[PDB]
């Protein structure tokens, strides 16, 4: 089908504000004497030397 | 698990071979008929000069089915072919000899002359 009206500013921006993003929950790692912040999902793989840390 | 427009074989002397189910009696909107439920049914085949004639509308009972049927004991039955018996308003057969076996259900439906005429009830 097809809309019928020019859906307003309020409604538009309101719903548009649901299309957002969340940030992964970060955690320290003692990468060879120094520290970097990495998700928890990848913690073991970092401590074992696979994660490409730039 | 029988219906309308269903063809059945006869187990009688009446001079018919086949029949057609028109209704299933025992209520309204009755869909299925099991071993011991009356029907009303016409004729689609005959012997040469049988008493019955091709086009009659008679009343019948089912004695065999191909679909299974539980019993109280947890047992079952399954014949190969769907058969039936012409019967008159006092629940008496028209014929004199029954062919093939039947079920034990008919003794408890009060169809008992049939069971007396049956060779092998199972």
């Amino acid at each position: 089908a097809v809309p019928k009206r020019r859906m307003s500013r309020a409604n538009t921006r309101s719903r548009r504000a649901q299309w957002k993003a969340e940030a992964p929950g970060l955690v320290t790692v003692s990468v060879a004497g120094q520290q970097r912040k990495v998700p928890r999902r990848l913690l073991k793989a970092a401590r074992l030397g696979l994660v490409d840390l730039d | 698990m029988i219906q309308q427009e269903s063809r059945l074989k006869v187990a009688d002397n009446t001079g018919a071979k086949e029949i057609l189910c028109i209704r299933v009696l025992g209520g309204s909107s009755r869909r299925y008929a099991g071993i011991g439920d009356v029907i009303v049914a016409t004729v689609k085949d005959a012997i040469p000069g049988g008493n019955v004639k091709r086009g009659d509308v008679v009343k019948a009972v089912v004695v065999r089915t191909v679909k299974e049927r539980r019993r109280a004991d947890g047992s079952y039955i399954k014949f190969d072919e769907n058969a039936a018996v012409i019967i008159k308003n006092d629940n008496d057969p028209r014929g004199t000899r029954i062919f093939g076996p039947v079920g034990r259900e008919l003794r408890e439906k009060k169809f008992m002359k049939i069971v007396s005429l049956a060779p092998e009830v199972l």
Binding site: R41, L42, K44, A45, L50, V51, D52 | -
Partner: protein, 118 residues
């Protein structure tokens, strides 16, 4: 093993089975492979069962392995080294390690290893 609960892994059971066999081949050939996650989740059990056949070594076990993977060098590898090497370890030969996602489709990725601790 326990079948896929839903739809399959590359478009059919055929492609799924072929894919699992190629990946077991590569695994036993190298020791590590990096692949998207549900492939690993699907490839732990397959591979552990092939390994168990290798452990319980025999002609019959060997043929019932060769009727999947199609690579004699890798079956020789199994029945020569990886079989006895995992004798006493009863169950649990593989390991999964999640890693950085993939650029093209954000898809998960995981490195599936064979353990080496006994």
């Amino acid at each position: 093993p326990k079948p896929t609960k839903g739809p399959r892994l590359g478009g059919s059971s055929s492609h799924q089975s072929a894919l699992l066999a190629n990946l077991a081949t590569s695994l036993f050939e190298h020791g590590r492979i990096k692949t998207t996650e549900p492939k690993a989740r699907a490839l732990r059990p397959y591979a552990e069962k092939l390994i168990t056949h290798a452990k319980k070594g025999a002609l019959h076990n060997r043929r019932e392995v060769m009727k999947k993977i199609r690579d004699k060098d890798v079956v020789h590898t199994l029945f020569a080294e990886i079989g006895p090497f995992y004798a006493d370890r009863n169950g649990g030969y593989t390991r999964i390690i999640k890693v950085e996602n993939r650029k093209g489709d954000n898809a998960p990725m995981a490195v599936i290893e064979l353990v080496r601790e006994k």
